[PDB]
């Protein structure tokens with residue numbers, strides 16, 4: 001059981017480079033539109049307190065330099081949608097996959113194609129934290145890298161990288177420019193607030209462990225939804241609902257282990273620790289696998 | 301700091317499906333040759349004790365069905381090289397990237413494009429263990445999935461998946477068909493032997509932690525190569541050499557922390573445990589990042 005990203009080839013064909021002034025970052029080229037973070041128009045001084053409407057008014061189509069590999073795209077229109085800039089270009093991307101723009105929920109996962117200067121660097125699998133941050137690896141110039149899921153042949157774009165809030169914690173928007181969480185694209189200190197552990201993901205991962213022969217943690221107890229959620233609150237785990245029980249149905253039926261039974265095992269993991277032992281090669285409870293991720297990786 | 305795979309698009313364009321009899325698996329289509337595990341010619345009974353030379357003699361070009369998406373490739377020659385079958389087809393793959401075949405060393409890393417029926421499923425980053433196994437996620441029909449590294453525009457293929465030795469541990473060949481380790485492509489029980497922790501990778505990861513602000517583990521001590529390797533042997537860590545010290549040079553110079561100083565810190569991590577604390581969000585020492593992987597992810 002590995003943390004698996006989606007194959008990134010369909011997204012690789014959409015990455016371009018966007019330059020305005022001296023600032024360069026990544027753009028997503030779909031049909032005849034290039035999407036990128038609006039702060040590409042900012043100077044370093046601008047970023048401390050930008051008036052984006054005023055700043056964009058001083059830019060014309062020809063101040064936006066868009067480069068797809070080594071061919072240069074002619075910008076014929078520009079528009080601000082929330083925190084994203086949409087650059088109308090004169091050429092439809094011939095590599096445009098079937099795609100949708102989706103806004104994901106906290107606790108769902110996606111792949112990130114980290115890019116620099118319009119060039120792919122690596123791919124990794126992320127979860128949208130309950131506090132709407134992402135724990136990623138993003139260096140300067142990675143802005144505009146996108147997060148996505150693939151359903152057969154259709155790419156569902158769900159995230160675009162905008163900013164680093166603190167060491168190792170990042171924030172961004174959907175592809176309509178709306179930030180996930182309360183963040184703004186301004187270089188002023190911003191609080192993310194208390195995060196929580198994604199309970200249903202932890203349970204899915206425990207099922208993954210059972211499916212892969214790892215079962216030391218299974219205990220003699222059961223529990224109730226309410227009894228468990230009292231334990232969940234003390235450990236800053238999200239409350240478990242019947243919706244979550246339902247989504248775990250494939251895993252509970254595959255293993256013959258009732259969800260409430262697994263909750264009892266999790267509760268004892270929480271109150272007693274792991275005692276130097278290991279689950280699926282990890283010494284902490286992993287919460288960045290959704291139930292679908294587990295079924296997917298166990299279905300091929 | 302995330303475990304990052306290479307962008308998989310260049311490899312996606314080379315995956316095909318290979319069927320012989322009822323057995324189907326993945327093939328790698330490069331130029332006018334398709335590479336795949338030779339056990340595609342085996343029945344379930346054959347796999348218990350195959351005579352591959354005898355079994356292949358009963359197959360002609362037309363018993364090999366090769367499918368690239370929905371177009372079918374005409375097989376005009378077949379050849380066994382070690383444990384790999386090479387199927388000469390009548391069409392060069394128009395998506396063939398610049399590529400090399402390389403045989404990696406234990407402790408080096410690579411990306412795996414897990415595939416089923418010739419179709420990409422996911423990508424993840426792996427290390428070749430010191431005992432020449434890989435800890436991956438491979439279901440039935442994943443054989444022929446390949447491991448690779450990318451240097452700018454050139455794909456270095458280094459691994460092809462052949463078999464599961466035990467729950468969660470896998471074995472395979474280079475692209476010349478030579479198994480990594482002592483394994484054979486036969487369904488008989490096979491020992492992998494004692495694994496060891498990749499010391500130089502652990503040290504690189506500790507540097508990654510310092511680069512990312514995580515430094516609680518840094519201590520007041522230093523040590524010597526010989527003193528440290530006495531501690532390494534007791535904990536089944538590979539001995540550290542001056543070659544390894546040299547490769548850590550970029551990280552030691554970036555952080556201002558001497559390698560032997562970090563070894564002292566690692567030694568105390570080893571003898572005292574982690575005391576419920578965390579390094580880069582992990583509760584165990586991670587050894588599947590090479591020094592180059594760390595420089596790469598810290599260089600963009």
Ligand SMILES: *[C@H](O)[C@H](CC(C)C)NC(=O)[C@H](CC(C)C)NC(=O)[C@H](CC(C)C)NC(=O)OCc1ccccc1
Nearest residue numbers: 039047139140141142143163164165185186187188189
């Ligand atoms: C885009 O490529 C780049 C990637 C970063 C990893 C550098 N992002 C930005 O340039 C972005 C532009 C502003 C207008 C949103 N700024 C940041 O991401 C910035 C980087 C940190 C290291 C300063 N983060 C930020 O401003 O968060 C708010 C903040 C302010 C002051 C102190 C801490 C946090």
Ligand SMILES: *[C@H](O)[C@H](CC(C)C)NC(=O)[C@H](CC(C)C)NC(=O)[C@H](CC(C)C)NC(=O)OCc1ccccc1
Nearest residue numbers: 339347439440441442443463464465485486487488489
């Ligand atoms: C290819 O797609 C497939 C992927 C496996 C994950 C199923 N591999 C094989 O079909 C391969 C063919 C043989 C001739 C190498 N067999 C295995 O991989 C087999 C699977 C296990 C679950 C039986 N592993 C194996 O034979 O290892 C040796 C062995 C034998 C007996 C008991 C334990 C281990």
Ligand SMILES: [Mg+2]
Nearest residue numbers: 037038039185
């Ligand atoms: Mg912005």
Ligand SMILES: [Mg+2]
Nearest residue numbers: 337338339485
């Ligand atoms: Mg074989």
